[PDB]
């Protein structure tokens, strides 16, 4: 049976090999899916001029100011003037219904983050029967790409279908801080997405001191921090390394079996002593 | 007196082996206490009816509409009517103080994200000496489960102790989104957590145009996107692979020692040439 | 030509070795640029008192109270009283411009999260021509460390440079919630950051019911959850040469090649049999 004992060592080795193979294959199956993610933060000297698409509707733009200081100056309510920005009016068909042309007002944003550059926009809307005043706006990465790239309808259609719009209220100013997150998929595209944290500041009617009762909106756009987020869905399943380790483990089993065979020859000598 | 020269590389090799073992055990110990995080997404054609747990207390319900258009239509002030919602009133002893009982009403939330159906409901509360108005509310995964599972009080106690209880103001509309994140514990249980980003839009007192001083609440629940987040806690450095790695390193080190000793025998022949 | 064919195993071996070296070099050179992020949550029985800094300017505090009960009490606004907080006024020059000296107040935060401790602060401000009333506040890890550490101006300069400041409006309260995120940087250092999610509730003017129309701001500070969130970036393998890995793989592969070539020598015996 001693022959069967050496084959018993061999069968233990084979069972270990079977367990190793099945464990490794199921581990590789699991690791192919459920990839882990990594986040890296980069710094930018000055953000690329972003694009803000407003949808005022029946409300006209009173004053747009590109203010460098982090403290905007005083304002004269309902006083047209002080327009030193860039604006383009567009008529594009929303993909949702292909029946309502959603007029858009496209405006350049702030670039110099380190000088706390910000954009101040004032809007006036004559009282109506809406019962709820709101404005919806959208953000996209670059404005010069929009201006230069032909078929602007196409670019903003892609923007609207891809990104999301979050409306700001009326009757009190809204402070908006933007942040950029870049994600890479299997196709190697650096998709850019925007995030914002809002902080509404109430507006005082004491300054007007009039009976007009006309709703006013104020928006402030600013860059939160120079840091840009970059999320990568990293993959830790390397077929070549796993195959190399599998072969190494197989040959380790075989060579440990050779060591055990040398020990079993020692034991054969032992038996010969007895 | 050269056997020590032959064993010099042997002792260096054993030092290498000790260093490798210490480093590997330290790495495994560090890895067993620092699990990694992963995130996954999916496209879902129809969400499961989420829970609604408004706690009016002393404010009655005037209207609750299950709209299917992203833009709710015009609404008159006050004038209760148009009840097209499913409601269930439940009383349960608090799970924190066991002193007070908070009467709650449960509503069925939007299901179709693709049609972007919203639920728009409004409450009014007569003048009171509170001087501050606000209504609590919390969400849970499903409403049909709660309707069917007996011993409701226990389910609500668990939901309240687990899910966060948010608060929405009174006096203007609070467009509230939703989003689901699902996590798997080491046991294997699936825990679903709600998170959302509210958006406040102001009311207008012109529509009432009366001296009533009555609160007019307004809430709009809506699904954000057809993406359900999953967070997974991946554990790296499984033990069998590490053991196989260490054994293979030992075998390779010993075979390198044997090859080096054969080459040292050749070099000793060379020395014999001198 | 049979000699070359006998070495053909060697040609394939050299190709495999080139591929393996290139793949491992590129992979482990690419694995340092983007490490892997890991997260965890720690439960804390009771937080360390944090320091809450405010910049009232022309505003004067009216009442600061700690409230262990979840529901804060109701009072008559406009009457100073019930001051049960600790404050240490400071006057320091900001780092951004080194020209504006900004007097700042500091108050003790809520410690016992389990007992539901919330800090209630009332501020009063006379009507002016500002047209936009807001107060910006900051959070630092522990007020006590500030009291103990000399050169306190330096501590707040560092705090202002590091942390971000977000303001709350004037006219309705704000129920600020706080949470702590700890991240370890590569240089053996731990950084603590504050996160929050505001929730504004409208304030009712019925209590004054007078023509003064003075501005009142109400702030509540609470702890979101006792959990502290730690995030750390960790690497994969840090050998800087990983010479042992590929060396052992190569030696194992070469010994396997030697055994297969002995088998091919048996095959040479075969060919001799023809
Ligand atoms: C020594 C060392 C090892 C590792 C490490 C290596 C591998 C690994 N996991 N996986 C694999 C996978 C496959 C393997 C294969 S294959 O399947 O056939 O391909 C074969 C073989 S083998 O049979 O040849 O052994 C393997 N061992 C394989 C393997 O280990 C893991 C998880 C870890 C990592 C680090 C490491 N030594 N690190 C050092 C080592 C030294 C450092 C030194 S020192 O002055 O030299 O003391 C200084 C400094 S400092 O100046 O920055 O302070 C350091 N940072 C030092 C340092 O970081």
CSV table of C-alpha atoms in Angstrom, one decimal, chain C residues 21-212:
chain,number,residue,atom,x,y,z
C,21,UNK,CA,9.1,42.1,-18.8
C,22,UNK,CA,7.5,44.8,-20.9
C,23,UNK,CA,4.0,44.2,-19.4
C,24,UNK,CA,5.2,44.1,-15.8
C,25,UNK,CA,7.3,47.2,-16.3
C,26,UNK,CA,4.6,49.3,-17.9
C,27,UNK,CA,1.9,48.1,-15.4
C,28,UNK,CA,3.9,48.8,-12.3
C,29,UNK,CA,5.1,52.1,-13.7
C,30,UNK,CA,1.5,53.0,-14.4
C,31,UNK,CA,0.3,51.9,-10.9
C,32,UNK,CA,2.0,54.7,-9.1
C,33,UNK,CA,0.3,57.6,-10.9
C,34,UNK,CA,-3.2,56.6,-9.7
C,35,UNK,CA,-3.4,54.9,-6.3
C,36,UNK,CA,-6.6,53.3,-5.0
C,37,UNK,CA,-8.9,55.1,-2.6
C,38,UNK,CA,-10.4,53.4,0.5
C,39,UNK,CA,-13.1,54.6,2.9
C,40,UNK,CA,-14.4,53.6,6.3
C,41,UNK,CA,-16.7,54.8,9.1
C,42,UNK,CA,-15.9,55.0,12.8
C,43,UNK,CA,-18.6,55.4,15.5
C,44,UNK,CA,-17.8,57.9,18.2
C,45,UNK,CA,-19.7,58.0,21.5
C,46,UNK,CA,-19.3,61.8,21.8
C,47,UNK,CA,-17.6,64.3,19.6
C,48,UNK,CA,-14.9,66.8,20.7
C,49,UNK,CA,-16.4,70.3,21.0
C,50,UNK,CA,-15.8,72.1,17.7
C,51,UNK,CA,-15.3,75.8,17.3
C,52,UNK,CA,-17.8,77.8,15.3
C,53,UNK,CA,-16.6,81.2,14.1
C,54,UNK,CA,-18.8,84.0,12.9
C,55,UNK,CA,-18.2,87.4,11.3
C,56,UNK,CA,-21.3,89.4,12.4
C,57,UNK,CA,-19.7,92.8,11.7
C,58,UNK,CA,-22.4,95.3,12.5
C,59,UNK,CA,-24.7,92.6,14.0
C,60,UNK,CA,-25.0,92.0,17.7
C,61,UNK,CA,-25.7,88.6,19.2
C,62,UNK,CA,-29.0,88.3,21.1
C,63,UNK,CA,-29.2,84.7,22.6
C,64,UNK,CA,-27.0,81.6,22.3
C,65,UNK,CA,-28.4,78.5,23.9
C,66,UNK,CA,-27.5,74.8,24.1
C,67,UNK,CA,-30.6,72.6,23.6
C,68,UNK,CA,-30.4,68.8,24.4
C,69,UNK,CA,-34.0,68.4,23.4
C,70,UNK,CA,-34.6,67.9,19.7
C,71,UNK,CA,-37.4,70.5,19.6
C,72,UNK,CA,-36.0,74.0,20.4
C,73,UNK,CA,-38.3,76.2,22.5
C,74,UNK,CA,-40.4,79.2,21.5
C,75,UNK,CA,-39.6,82.7,22.6
C,76,UNK,CA,-40.5,86.3,21.9
C,77,UNK,CA,-37.9,87.7,19.5
C,78,UNK,CA,-36.2,91.1,20.0
C,79,UNK,CA,-35.5,90.8,23.8
C,80,UNK,CA,-31.9,89.9,24.7
C,81,UNK,CA,-31.5,87.2,27.3
C,82,UNK,CA,-30.7,83.6,28.0
C,83,UNK,CA,-27.0,83.7,27.1
C,84,UNK,CA,-25.3,80.4,28.1
C,85,UNK,CA,-22.4,80.2,25.6
C,86,UNK,CA,-18.7,80.8,25.8
C,87,UNK,CA,-17.1,83.4,23.5
C,88,UNK,CA,-13.6,84.9,22.9
C,89,UNK,CA,-13.7,87.8,20.6
C,90,UNK,CA,-10.8,88.1,18.2
C,91,UNK,CA,-9.5,90.7,15.7
C,92,UNK,CA,-7.2,89.4,13.0
C,93,UNK,CA,-6.1,90.3,9.5
C,94,UNK,CA,-7.1,88.0,6.7
C,95,UNK,CA,-4.4,86.4,4.5
C,96,UNK,CA,-6.1,87.1,1.1
C,97,UNK,CA,-5.4,90.8,1.1
C,98,UNK,CA,-3.5,91.6,4.3
C,99,UNK,CA,-5.4,94.9,4.3
C,100,UNK,CA,-8.9,94.1,5.8
C,101,UNK,CA,-8.9,93.2,9.5
C,102,UNK,CA,-12.1,91.2,10.3
C,103,UNK,CA,-13.3,90.9,13.9
C,104,UNK,CA,-14.5,87.4,14.5
C,105,UNK,CA,-16.6,85.7,17.2
C,106,UNK,CA,-16.0,82.1,18.3
C,107,UNK,CA,-18.5,79.9,20.1
C,108,UNK,CA,-18.4,76.3,21.5
C,109,UNK,CA,-20.1,73.7,19.3
C,110,UNK,CA,-22.4,70.8,20.3
C,111,UNK,CA,-20.5,67.9,21.9
C,112,UNK,CA,-23.0,65.1,22.9
C,113,UNK,CA,-24.4,64.0,19.5
C,114,UNK,CA,-26.2,61.0,21.2
C,115,UNK,CA,-28.1,63.3,23.6
C,116,UNK,CA,-29.1,65.4,20.5
C,117,UNK,CA,-27.3,68.6,21.4
C,118,UNK,CA,-28.0,71.6,19.1
C,119,UNK,CA,-26.8,75.1,19.4
C,120,UNK,CA,-29.3,77.9,18.8
C,121,UNK,CA,-28.1,81.4,17.9
C,122,UNK,CA,-30.1,84.5,17.4
C,123,UNK,CA,-28.6,87.6,15.7
C,124,UNK,CA,-30.2,91.0,15.2
C,125,UNK,CA,-29.3,93.6,12.6
C,126,UNK,CA,-30.7,97.1,12.0
C,127,UNK,CA,-31.9,97.9,8.5
C,128,UNK,CA,-29.2,99.4,6.3
C,129,UNK,CA,-28.5,99.9,2.6
C,130,UNK,CA,-26.6,96.6,2.1
C,131,UNK,CA,-29.5,95.2,0.1
C,132,UNK,CA,-28.2,91.6,0.7
C,133,UNK,CA,-27.8,90.5,4.3
C,134,UNK,CA,-25.7,87.4,4.9
C,135,UNK,CA,-23.3,86.1,7.5
C,136,UNK,CA,-20.3,83.9,6.7
C,137,UNK,CA,-19.2,81.3,9.3
C,138,UNK,CA,-16.3,78.8,9.7
C,139,UNK,CA,-15.7,75.6,11.5
C,140,UNK,CA,-12.6,74.3,13.2
C,141,UNK,CA,-11.8,71.1,14.9
C,142,UNK,CA,-11.7,72.1,18.6
C,143,UNK,CA,-12.3,75.4,20.3
C,144,UNK,CA,-10.2,74.1,23.3
C,145,UNK,CA,-7.1,73.6,21.2
C,146,UNK,CA,-7.5,77.2,20.1
C,147,UNK,CA,-7.8,78.5,23.7
C,148,UNK,CA,-4.7,76.5,24.6
C,149,UNK,CA,-2.4,77.3,21.6
C,150,UNK,CA,-0.7,80.7,21.8
C,151,UNK,CA,-0.3,82.9,18.7
C,152,UNK,CA,-4.0,82.2,18.1
C,153,UNK,CA,-3.9,84.7,15.2
C,154,UNK,CA,-1.8,82.1,13.5
C,155,UNK,CA,-4.2,79.3,14.2
C,156,UNK,CA,-7.1,81.2,12.6
C,157,UNK,CA,-4.9,82.3,9.7
C,158,UNK,CA,-4.2,78.6,9.0
C,159,UNK,CA,-7.8,77.7,9.4
C,160,UNK,CA,-9.0,80.4,7.0
C,161,UNK,CA,-6.4,79.4,4.4
C,162,UNK,CA,-7.3,75.7,4.7
C,163,UNK,CA,-11.0,75.4,5.3
C,164,UNK,CA,-13.8,76.9,3.1
C,165,UNK,CA,-16.4,79.4,4.3
C,166,UNK,CA,-20.1,79.3,3.4
C,167,UNK,CA,-22.6,81.9,4.5
C,168,UNK,CA,-26.2,81.8,5.7
C,169,UNK,CA,-28.7,84.4,4.7
C,170,UNK,CA,-30.8,86.7,6.8
C,171,UNK,CA,-34.6,86.5,7.0
C,172,UNK,CA,-35.1,82.9,7.7
C,173,UNK,CA,-33.3,80.4,9.9
C,174,UNK,CA,-30.8,77.7,8.9
C,175,UNK,CA,-30.6,74.2,10.4
C,176,UNK,CA,-26.9,73.5,9.7
C,177,UNK,CA,-25.8,69.9,10.1
C,178,UNK,CA,-22.1,68.9,10.5
C,179,UNK,CA,-20.0,65.9,9.8
C,180,UNK,CA,-16.3,65.1,10.0
C,181,UNK,CA,-14.1,63.7,7.2
C,182,UNK,CA,-10.5,62.6,8.0
C,183,UNK,CA,-7.9,62.1,5.2
C,184,UNK,CA,-4.3,61.0,5.6
C,185,UNK,CA,-1.8,62.5,3.2
C,186,UNK,CA,1.4,60.7,2.1
C,187,UNK,CA,3.6,62.7,4.4
C,188,UNK,CA,2.4,61.1,7.6
C,189,UNK,CA,-0.2,63.7,8.3
C,190,UNK,CA,-3.9,63.7,9.0
C,191,UNK,CA,-6.3,66.4,7.9
C,192,UNK,CA,-9.8,67.0,9.2
C,193,UNK,CA,-12.5,68.7,7.2
C,194,UNK,CA,-16.1,69.6,7.8
C,195,UNK,CA,-19.1,68.8,5.6
C,196,UNK,CA,-22.7,70.1,6.0
C,197,UNK,CA,-26.1,70.1,4.3
C,198,UNK,CA,-28.1,73.2,5.1
C,199,UNK,CA,-31.9,73.3,5.4
C,200,UNK,CA,-33.6,76.7,5.5
C,201,UNK,CA,-37.0,77.2,7.1
C,202,UNK,CA,-39.0,80.4,6.7
C,203,UNK,CA,-39.3,82.8,9.6
C,204,UNK,CA,-42.7,84.4,10.4
C,205,UNK,CA,-43.1,88.1,11.0
C,206,UNK,CA,-46.2,87.7,13.2
C,207,UNK,CA,-44.1,87.9,16.4
C,208,UNK,CA,-42.8,91.5,15.9
C,209,UNK,CA,-45.9,92.7,14.1
C,210,UNK,CA,-44.4,96.2,14.2
C,211,UNK,CA,-43.1,98.8,11.7
C,212,UNK,CA,-39.5,98.5,12.9
